[PDB]
Each structure stands twice: as C-alpha cells, then as structure tokens.
Amino acid sequence: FVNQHLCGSHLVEALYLVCXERXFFYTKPT
Amino acid sequence: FVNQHLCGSHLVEALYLVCXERXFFYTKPT
Amino acid sequence: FVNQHLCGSHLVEALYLVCXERXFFYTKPT
Amino acid sequence: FVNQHLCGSHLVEALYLVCXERXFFYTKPT
Amino acid sequence: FVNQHLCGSHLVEALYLVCXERXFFYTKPT
Amino acid sequence: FVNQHLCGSHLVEALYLVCXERXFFYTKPT
Amino acid sequence: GIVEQCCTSICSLYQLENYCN
Amino acid sequence: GIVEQCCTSICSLYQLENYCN
Amino acid sequence: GIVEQCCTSICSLYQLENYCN
Amino acid sequence: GIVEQCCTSICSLYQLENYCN
Amino acid sequence: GIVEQCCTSICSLYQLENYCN
Amino acid sequence: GIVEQCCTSICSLYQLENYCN
Ligand SMILES: [Cl-]
Ligand SMILES: [Cl-]
Ligand SMILES: [Zn+2]
Ligand SMILES: [Zn+2]
Numbered sequence: 281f282v283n284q285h286l287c288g289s290h291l292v293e294a295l296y297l298v299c300x301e302r303x304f305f306y307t308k309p310t
Numbered sequence: 311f312v313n314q315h316l317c318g319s320h321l322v323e324a325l326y327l328v329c330x331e332r333x334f335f336y337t338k339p340t
Numbered sequence: 341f342v343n344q345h346l347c348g349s350h351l352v353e354a355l356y357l358v359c360x361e362r363x364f365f366y367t368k369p370t
Numbered sequence: 371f372v373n374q375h376l377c378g379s380h381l382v383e384a385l386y387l388v389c390x391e392r393x394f395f396y397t398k399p400t
Numbered sequence: 401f402v403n404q405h406l407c408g409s410h411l412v413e414a415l416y417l418v419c420x421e422r423x424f425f426y427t428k429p430t
Numbered sequence: 431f432v433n434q435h436l437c438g439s440h441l442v443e444a445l446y447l448v449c450x451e452r453x454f455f456y457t458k459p460t
Numbered sequence: 461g462i463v464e465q466c467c468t469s470i471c472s473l474y475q476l477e478n479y480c481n
Numbered sequence: 482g483i484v485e486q487c488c489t490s491i492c493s494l495y496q497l498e499n500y501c502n
Numbered sequence: 503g504i505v506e507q508c509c510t511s512i513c514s515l516y517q518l519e520n521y522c523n
Numbered sequence: 524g525i526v527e528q529c530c531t532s533i534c535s536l537y538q539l540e541n542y543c544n
Numbered sequence: 545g546i547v548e549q550c551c552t553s554i555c556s557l558y559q560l561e562n563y564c565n
Numbered sequence: 566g567i568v569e570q571c572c573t574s575i576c577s578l579y580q581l582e583n584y585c586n
Contacts, residue, residue: 330514353383
C-alpha cells in the first residue's frame with residue numbers, strides 16, 4: 281500500500297505536466 | 311517565464327502530501 | 341531493495357516540506 | 371524566498387543521491 | 401543563477417513521461 | 431505493475447543531478 | 461479511479477489526459 | 482490564486498492546507 | 503529508522519515532524 | 524535548442540517526442 | 545539497459561556516474 | 566549555507582559533498 285502512496289506523488293506530477301492549463305481534481309483511494 | 315510552471319509542479323506535490331485523503335482541485339489560471 | 345531507496349527519496353522531499361525553518365537531519369538505513 | 375525554497379527541494383534530493391549511506395544535514399537559514 | 405538547472409530537472413521528468421518506451425539522452429548546453 | 435516505470439522517473443532525475451555539465455544517456459532498447 | 465488504474469498499470473500521457481480539466 | 486501566493490512567497494503547511502477540498 | 507517506520511506503513515505529516523531538527 | 528526554448532516558454536508535450544531515443 | 549541494472553537493485557553514485565559523460 | 570552557496574550558482578557534485586555527513 282505504501283507503494284500506492286509513492287505512486288500517488290508520481291501521478292499528481294505526471295497529470296500536472298500533461299494537463300497544464302486545464303489541470304485536474306485529485307482524490308485519494310481507500 | 312516558466313517560473314510558475316515549475317512552481318506548479320511543486321505545489322501539486324506539496325498538496326498531495328498535505329491534503330492526504332481529502333484530495334484537491336488544481337488549476338493554472340490563478 | 342530499490343523501493344526502500346526510492347521511498348527514501350520521497351521521505352527526503354516530504355521532510356523538506358514539513359521541517360520548514362527547523363530544518364532536518366537525515367541518515368540512511370543499512 | 372520560494373526561489374531558495376524551490377531550489378531547496380532540488381538540493382535535498384541531490385544530497386540524498388550523492389551522500390549514500392553517509393546521509394546528510396539540511397539547514398534552513400531563516 | 402540556477403534557473404536553467406532547476407528548469408532542466410523538470411524538463412527531464414517531462415521528457416520521461418513522453419519517451420518512456422523509447423527513452424532519451426540529455427545534454428546541459430543543448 | 432508500475433514499479434520500474436516509477437523507478438525510471440527516479441533514474442532520469444538522479445542522472446540529471448549527478449552528471450551536471452556532462453549530461454547523460456538513459457537507454458532501454460540497446 | 462485514476463490511482464486504481466494508473467498504479468497497477470502504466471498510464472501513458474494519452475491515458476492520463478482522461479483525468480484532466 | 483495559489484501561484485500568485487505560494488510561488489512568489491513560501492506557503493507553510495498551514496497555508497497549503499487551505500487548498501484541500 | 504525512518505525507512506522502517508515510514509516506508510513499511512504510511513507516516514502522516516505529524517509523524518514525519520518527529521524527524522525534523 | 525529545446526532546453527532554452529522550453530525554459531523560456533512552456534513547451535507542449537508532443538514536441539518532446541523528437542528527443543526520445 | 546539502465547533500467548535492468550538500476551531498478552533490479554540499487555545503483556551506487558558511481559554506477560550512475562557511468563551513464564554520464 | 567548550501568542555499569546561498571548553491572542556489573546562487575550551480576553546485577558541483579563535490580561542492581555538494583561538503584554537506585554530507
Ligand atoms: Cl517510487
Ligand atoms: Cl524550480
Ligand atoms: Zn517515487
Ligand atoms: Zn523545481
């Protein structure tokens with residue numbers, strides 16, 4: 281699960297780079 | 311000029327750690 | 341293993357963000 | 371100074387990778 | 401100043417998100 | 431699995447910080 | 461969600477665009 | 482916005498939290 | 503170590519504040 | 524080149540593929 | 545390549561240094 | 566401090582080592 285937490289950080293950064301202007305809304309899993 | 315772009319990348323990472331389960335909405339057009 | 345090495349880098353950034361002024365001390369496991 | 375704050379984030383990461391087992395110390399000079 | 405250096409550490413991540421399956425090589429004074 | 435994909439993100443960043451002026455080459459194919 | 465899909469299976473930039481805006 | 486206030490001046494843990502949904 | 507305590511299980515910000523100077 | 528360009532003004536993902544191995 | 549060697553086990557500063565110029 | 570010395574001018578890998586334990 282700590283794998284899940286590490287992944288998150290990467291996802292948040294990747295999404296940011298991909299979307300830029302549009303940006304997103306993020307939500308943590310159970 | 312890319313200052314804000316570079317900073318945004320840090321902010322989304324900082325908020326991922328801060329907001330934990332709560333998550334967040336993020337956008338460029340400050 | 342690697343993930344320990346990789347998680348270590350995540351702790352370092354997470355510590356940078358929370359220690360604020362106080363700063364921090366960091367020593368890797370064996 | 372976010373200039374030094376943002377740069378700090380990158381500095382703590384570089385030390386982690388360069389110091390190895392020896393670890394490191396990070397100070398926030400007010 | 402380290403404006404280029406900071407920027408470059410993010411660009412690398414951006415180059416990674418695109419290349420992945422194909423990779424890339426980097427040079428400081430492009 | 432995303433383990434190696436994430437590990438890649440870390441490798442590209444570390445080679446950037448560690449190599450400085452000498453830049454680097456990240457290879458996967460040959 | 462995005463974590464469930466992108467943390468078990470790699471999500472290229474093209475897949476990641478689905479969770480934008 | 483957030484950039485205007487956290488990129489021109491450091492935001493602490495407390496200020497950042499203001500943006501959690 | 504912080505690895506054993508914070509990589510095995512997740513550590514909150516309030517727990518990481520333990521490793522601050 | 525790409526660096527100065529992408530650090531002076533924000534670059535679109537698509538242009539970066541020209542640099543993949 | 546660099547993934548096979550440095551993601552199966554940790555590469556030291558020296559090992560990574562081999563990918564520089 | 567590292568900041569003054571390293572955010573002013575890019576710090577060499579060995580100049581960064583003067584900050585290792
Ligand atoms: Cl990771
Ligand atoms: Cl930056
Ligand atoms: Zn990671
Ligand atoms: Zn940065």
